Amino acid sequence: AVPSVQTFGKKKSATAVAHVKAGKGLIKVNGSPITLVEPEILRFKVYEPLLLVGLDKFSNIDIRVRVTGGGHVSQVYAIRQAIAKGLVAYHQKYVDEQSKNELKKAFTSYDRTLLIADSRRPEPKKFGGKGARSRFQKSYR
Amino acid sequence: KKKWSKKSMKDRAQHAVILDQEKYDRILKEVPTYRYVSVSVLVDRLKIGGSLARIALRHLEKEGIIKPISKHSKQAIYTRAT
Amino acid sequence: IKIRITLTSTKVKQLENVSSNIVKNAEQHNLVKKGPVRLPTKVLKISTRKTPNGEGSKTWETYEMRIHKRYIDLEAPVQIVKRITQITIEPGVDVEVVVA
């Protein structure tokens, strides 16, 4: 057996299951490396867990993610949460907390939702209006 | 049938599309002393059209007069090569 | 054999009771089986205007029937098998057994 963990990152409806094991350290997004997410502005949003901790920590571990659901923006935030969660959970299972403790305050001081999925969920649409809160229009004369 | 306004017209600018030899060499000396070159730069200046402002912009690349920093479509940003 | 028992009730308490009796029947009949596989609950929504006529504020109303489905795969001779069909019947519980 090989040292392997698995995590998931979440968004509105996008889930990204990341398989983190030991190896040379390729990172793949559903078939393809990190440089080909292609919003090309949220591409640098996905580099953010990697660029915060240095690329030396990723030299021993390879991560493969499978992202479904949501849209293009929401899938990006599912990846960047799954990368940080998978990196932490590997350092839970196999190496010391001294990496972990400096990993988590590096994440949480910068951006909180790197490790935790945000609680904002859609509100149901209500009758008498097009949206959750709005109404149609009132007429009197 | 009420306008509820006056709807004043415009000045009817007459930007020419095709260039000529007098307009050809005009962009050669005058592209230097522009600190920033784009399609909108070459239209608010001398009155060539937007399409030739793209074609003559790509023309300046194969020889090299002005330098790139970004090559996004719909916004081409171009500075002077010193 | 590879028969399946599918339960499609709308009351969850009797359906879990019937499912529990079936899986505890095969347990004392020492049979290696597929567990109670739980399908997603079907929510049948019907939205209607509350008003009989068309007067008043446009107030709507969504009635809803929740159907819960569960199936267990079992592998036993027919003399055993016909007796699960004989037992474990509850009100509002639809019990079906198919072969292969």
């Binding site: 949220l42 690329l55 | 608010d44 970004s70 | -």
Partner: protein
């Protein structure tokens, strides 16, 4: 700096932007100190972001919007006037092009230009309405530092939107010349002209 190769080929530019200095796409968040007082810790610098897109939540509390970076606040005001509601990826791309144009012209830091634009065009006095009765009357009041920043972002983005409407100039360059003129002070930007006429009304209605 140390070049590290890896199974997926990491470019050097994203490597240099990672370890050397935490940047924008190419811009730095240092030496961007705001010279104008009373607006410190209400314009957000020293908190770096790589891109203006962040899924933060600042509408939960009252003064939480002050902690949002001023680049992201500019992109949020850029997506306005109806059909541009949402579409934040266009707002970031417009801002990225705008900061490039603020680099080739007026070669100082584009982050330093926008924070000078915010501070110069922020109205320090304005007028409210008293109970008019027969006729409404204006009364001059002072402006909070939060509202000074909020008015500055709104005035800059409105003037750029009106300038780019129905003309050949794009939204990126019209916003750039609005931010350049507001940082200088010229009474030709729409932001400055609205500020002085608001303070003139406040002066005559004390």
């Amino acid at each position: 700096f140390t070049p590290v190769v890896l199974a997926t080929p990491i470019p050097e530019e994203v490597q240099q932007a990672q370890t050397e200095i935490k940047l924008f796409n190419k811009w730095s968040f240092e030496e961007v100190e705001v010279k104008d007082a009373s607006l410190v810790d209400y314009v957000q610098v020293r908190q770096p972001i790589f891109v203006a897109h962040t899924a933060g939540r600042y509408a939960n509390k009252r003064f939480r919007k002050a902690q949002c970076p001023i680049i992201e606040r500019l992109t949020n005001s850029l997506m306005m006037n109806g059909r541009n509601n949402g579409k934040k990826l266009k707002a970031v791309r417009i801002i990225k092009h705008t900061l490039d144009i603020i680099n080739v012209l007026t070669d100082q830091n584009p982050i330093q230009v926008v924070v000078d634009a915010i501070t110069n065009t922020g109205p320090r006095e304005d007028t409210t309405r008293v109970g008019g009765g027969g006729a409404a009357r204006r009364q001059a009041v002072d402006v909070s530092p939060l509202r000074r920043v909020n008015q500055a972002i709104a005035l800059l983005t409105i003037g750029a939107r009106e300038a780019a409407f129905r003309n050949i100039k794009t939204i990126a360059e019209t916003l750039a010349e609005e931010l350049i003129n507001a940082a200088k002070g010229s009474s030709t930007s729409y932001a400055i002209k609205k500020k002085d006429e608001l303070e003139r009304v406040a002066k005559s209605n004390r």
